[PDB]
Every structure is written in structure tokens, then in C-alpha cells.
């Protein structure tokens, strides 16, 4: 937990998020275009960081914004509120949203708590926890989140894992036979989700989606995320794993605005995420690839990813276990 | 410390070090060419990782090798010891070298405990701690470590970091004035040591050298490291900061072998490290740039670095703090 908040205490890391124009600009649009959800309202910004989203709420006419931040970035946010002459409308509260007190309930909660695969870092639990401060029938921005999953083919990505692991498959590395560790090295590489982007042409079926409605969901609902899937294959080929991305929707009174990290959309700082299967699966066009993706929360602020999958027509099966806390940036 | 040993538990990270041919090859040359320091001797490998250095000690004819390793990599080392039929000579000992109980005093300690700028990660303290197991006559491989510092000029590097920091100069980022944080951003960005390599042509004077003798140094000596300097400037220009590298020497009974990470030598996985000044110092050829680099060990297995430098001929001074645990790896 200390390292987590120390990371967000760096201005360079806040800057990284601020500079993601799709992200920051879409939040600004969502808030300003839904000005009646803000005008003269009370706002909670969960994990304000620099304060940027709270400034957008102020731009849209909010009366009072409580900006809660657990890292030492709270001190820098405070400097910005004073220097932007907004002391009377934005109040920076240092600490965890789970531990602080607010002086009143709010009309609307705003936050950017989305990790890789939507759920990484487990901050959505803090966002849902914050609903203890939300007036009855208050709103949340973002309001819902969709995680999409789809099968891909990438022969070169799959092959790469062996190329790397075959370092160990040599009998005389400076006189040492390394070969006995090759299997362990393979296993290690396959446990890493791959964070990068890709051409949509690699996708072999229409995505399935799993939706969380943040107005209704409880913290505990994010501890175990079960995503069944049944893909009807558009192309014949070897399925090397599943690709993941996510969308959030800001459902306001005037309009619904979407922030998407899909591979069809301009790139964001989240990229997309791919989990390889241990062993690829052959599927022909029209076959069904079924199984479940289970995301199991862990004590390292992340998830273990369990994927089991089969091609129904053949019965050939595969699986993988991945560690979302150890992604490979490709 | 839990994260620290977890990192070294990954085979991919052990591979990264092993695939540094200069590093791994030079360790092997040092050990094999000084085989009389190993022949029928007792050896301690501090932080054996894959076991690689312990295999080198076995190649040189060591009677018995205690291969100490605190990460889960210990289990993989033992797989290799067995698959290489060396259970008779290499004894993997899981745990911290500070906390295990070896049955025997040793003739020689081998290790690769060097971090960025030599001292990062504080593993040299574990290496020095291990001297409780060293016989009076005993040797250490490496035997000494030299840190080199020299002033550099690199306007492109300076402007890259300055431009990042000046994101926080913006008076209207999506309508928001960030400019009150300009100074805080410059402080943070310039606290990051820059890890990459560079052309030697950027160096403005001969390096100053600080030496640690591992045969004599006590663990506590590395808690405060004071390196005074007085550079005789060989070129006129802006001094953008100090560049650091390090060498280690294996002082064997037969021969001394050096492993160098200098920018005049083939690249190693350590690259070199540069500490930028927030504002460069103007110097003329013939001037003297004097001051002190002070490294203070901290509770995050790293060092707070203080660099105070002044051009004596003008009184122009730069004071800098750097966080050796937050390096910027530049592509
Ligand atoms: C706040 N919303 C946008 C976050 N958006 C910018 C930040 C980015 C990110 C965060 C973190 C979070 N962090 C400091 C952790 O301690 C942590 C915790 C749980 C899990 C986790 O998994 C990762 C491991 C390696 C690399 C990245 C994550 C990291 C680390 C690195 N990069 C993630 C993407
Ligand atoms: C054993 N000698 C060779 C090590 N050689 C291969 C490993 C390489 C390295 C080690 C570490 C050490 N580590 C796991 C830490 O927890 C740690 C501890 C203290 C400080 C520290 O400073 C860094 C911060 C960011 C990136 C790197 C270091 C890291 C992390 C990343 N890369 C360093 C170089
Ligand atoms: N439980 C919690 N309570 C308070 N702040 C938290 C928190 N969990 C995460 N945070 C903070 O939430 C922020 C997420 S990054 C988003 C920052 C900013 N709102 C923006 O959109 O640019 C980080 O600054 C992190 O320190
Ligand atoms: N105090 C300590 N006790 C035991 N092992 C340690 C230690 N401090 C660091 N290590 C281990 O020392 C190793 C340093 S990396 C070098 C690995 C190997 N000797 C090689 O040269 O290739 C890591 O595997 C790390 O886990």
C-alpha cells in the first residue's frame, strides 16, 4: 500500500495520466456537457491526484467539491486550488476515502479508478466504498464499466515466449547445462499478461462483455469476477489467447459520454491486454470457443486470472493462470 | 525487502544478468585464471542467483561451495546443481547471508553485489557482512570497487528533462493553471538519476575516483559515503551534471582482472548513471569545479545523494539532491 501511494505521489505519474488526451479530454467533455449534473451541486472526487477532475467539476458550476487523495499529491492539489483561486469551492481532504470524514453528503461522485483490464489495482472498490457519502438517487461518473473479451490469433507473440525461454535450453552456458530450467522459464513467461496494442484483424470472434453498474455494485462484488464466454468463430485459425479492453460510460441528464480503450479506438495509456493460452486451440469458422475467465482478487492489490477454454466441436481444451500484477509491456 | 527478493526470484531477471557477457565472462576469467585461489578451497557465494558464479568456482577446482540465496531462485539453483551432477561440491543454502549458519569458515567469498553507481540496493553491506565467515588469510572476489565521477555537458539531455518538468509551467492546461507547481516538478524530475550510455566526448574533465577495499571495509562504512572532488576543467562549456561509473578488481594470487562499466569500455547492463544539475554551471577551460558528493544510506535499500558543486573562479554554485531509488532509464 505504501509503494502504491508513493507512486501516485510523483508529479510525473500524475502528468502521464493528465497527458492522455483521450482520457483527460473525455472526462472534461463528460462533465461540461452534463453541466446540470454539476451546477450548484456537491461533488466527491475519489482520488483527486492533481485535482484535475475537480477543476472540471468547478468549470461545470459545482458549488462544493471534496477532493480526497491518499498520496502526498494532496499537498500539490492544495497548492493548485489556492493558486487557481478556488479555495471556497474545492476542499482537498488528505487520506484514504475509506478513512477520512466528509462534512456532508454529495450529489455526485467523480473518479478515474480504472486499471488495466478495468479492475487492476482494485481502486474501483474504493470508488464503490465512497457511495457511503452519496445522497439517495445521487449519480456516479463514470456510471458503468464494460470489460470486453475476444479470442485472437498471434503466431509471433506465441512463438516469442519459447524464443525467450530457450536461453535456458543450452548444454554449456559458460560450461553450465541450463536445460533443466527451460520448463520453469516457459511457465514464468506465460503467467504475464501482455500490455500493448494490436491490429483488429487478429481478433477471431465478436467480443463478449461483462458490465458493472457502479450505481448498484457493492465492493465485495469485485472480489470474484466470473466471465463466461461462448465465442462463435468468424475465422478459421489457431486461437492463441484472449484480448481484453474496457469502456466506461458517463450517464448524465443531458447525454451519455463514453471513454473507450478498445483497439478500434485511438490509443490510451491503458493500451489493451492479452492473455495467452498455454497451448493454442484450433477452431474453424462457425465453431464455438467456450469457457470462463475468472478474476480472483488478491492481497497485492490485483487479480489472479484463470482462463479455461475449449472448442466445443473437438473437445480440445486449454487453460492459463496469469498474474495481473506482473504484466509484460511489449 | 519482500519485493526485492521477489524480483530476483524471476528467471527472466537472472537471465538479464547472465546474458551480460562482459559481466559473466569477466567473472569467469577472474575465477578460472586465478584457479589456485579456488583449488581445494572452501568458497562462499553471496547471493548465488542461478548458481552461475558457484559453477565457476567448481570449474576452478573448489572443494566445497556454499551458495547462499534468499530468493526463491535458491530452488532453481539446486535444480541446476543436481542436473550438472555437482551435488558433491555446491551446497545451496536458502536464506539471507546474515541469518543462515554455515558449518565452516571459508577461504574466499565471491559475489556480484554491485548496483547502479556501485552502491544501489545496498547488497555490498551483505557482501561485507559475510566476512564473519572469512578465514584470516582469505580473499574476496571482487576485492576492491572504484567509483568514478566526471563533469559532463549534454544540452539535449538537460532540455529533455527540463521540458518534461515544464509541463507544470502551463498556465491553462484544460483551463487550469499548473504554474504554481513548476518548482516542485523541476525538483522531482532533477532528483532522478539518468541511466543510459553516452559518448565520452561529453566529459569535461578527468574523473575523480573513490575506492572501497572490500577486504578492509566494514558494513557500517557504507552508510555514509563522502566523495570530495576538484575537477580541472579541460573544456569550456556548460556543466550539466556529474556522470558516474564503476570498476571492480579481482585481485587474485596469480593475476588481477578488472570488470569495468566505464563509457570507454563495452556496454554492460549497468550502463552509466548521470546526476543532472537543475541549472548548469558555466565553466572555462582551466577553471576548477570543486565540491562534494555525499551518499547517505536510507531504509529503502538505497541512497539519498547530495551533490554540491561550485566553479571556484566565479562562485557559481549548484546544490542537488537525488533519489538513487528513482532512476530514469532513457531510450
Ligand atoms: C488511476 N487510473 C489509471 C492508472 N494508469 C496509470 C498508472 C499505471 C500504473 C499503476 C501502478 C500502480 N502501483 C504503483 C502499484 O503498486 C500496483 C498495484 C496493483 C497492481 C499493479 O499492477 C501493475 C504492475 C506493473 C505496471 C502497472 C501496473 C501495480 C504502477 C505502474 N503504473 C496504470 C494505468
Ligand atoms: C546484482 N547486481 C546487478 C543488478 N542489476 C540487475 C538488476 C537491476 C534491478 C534491480 C532491482 C532491485 N530491486 C528489486 C529493488 O527492489 C530495489 C532496491 C533498492 C533500490 C532499487 O533501485 C532501482 C529502482 C528502479 C530500477 C532499478 C533499481 C531497487 C530492481 C530493478 N532492476 C539492477 C542491476
Ligand atoms: N482509497 C483511496 N483513497 C484516496 N485516494 C486514492 C485511493 N486509491 C487511490 N487513490 C488515488 O487515486 C488516484 C488515481 S489516479 C487519477 C488522478 C486524477 N483523479 C486524474 O484523473 O487525473 C491516485 O492519485 C491515487 O493516489
Ligand atoms: N543478503 C542476501 N542474502 C542472500 N542473497 C542475497 C542477499 N542480497 C541479495 N541476494 C541475492 O543476490 C543476488 C544478486 S544478483 C547476482 C546473481 C548471481 N550471483 C550472478 O552473478 O549472476 C540475487 O539473486 C539476490 O536475491
Numbering used by the authors:
A (entry chain B): 147 to 476
B (entry chain A): 147 to 477
What did the paper state?
The co-crystal structure of PRMT4 in complex with N-methyl-N-((2-(1-(2-(methylamino)ethyl)piperidin-4-yl)pyridin-4-yl)methyl)-3-phenoxybenzamide (TP-064) provided structural evidence for the specificity of inhibition. We found that TP-064 inhibited the methyltransferase activity of PRMT4, with an IC50 value of < 10 nM. Surface plasmon resonance (SPR) analysis revealed that binding only occurred in the presence of S-adenosyl methionine (SAM), yielding a Kd value of 7.1 ± 1.8 nM, with kon = 1.1 ± 0.1 × 105 M−1s−1 and koff = 0.7 ± 0.1 × 10−3 s−1 from kinetic fitting. The structure showed that TP-064 was bound to the substrate-binding site adjacent to SAH. The methylaminoethyl tail of TP-064 occupied the arginine-binding pocket and formed three hydrogen bonds with PRMT4: two were between the side chain of Glu258 and backbone carbonyl group of Met260, and one was between N1 and the side chain of His415, suggesting the importance of this moiety for strong PRMT4 inhibition. The other moieties of TP-064 engaged in hydrogen bonding with the side chain of Asn266 and hydrophobic interactions. In the PRMT4 complex, TP-064 engaged in a π-stacking interaction with Phe153 and formed a hydrogen bond with Asn266. Hydrophobic interactions with Pro473, Phe475, and water-mediated hydrogen bonding with Lys471 and Ser146 were also observed only with PRMT4. Although we did not observe a clear pattern of competitive inhibition for TP-064, the crystal structure showed that TP-064 occupied the substrate-binding site of PRMT4.
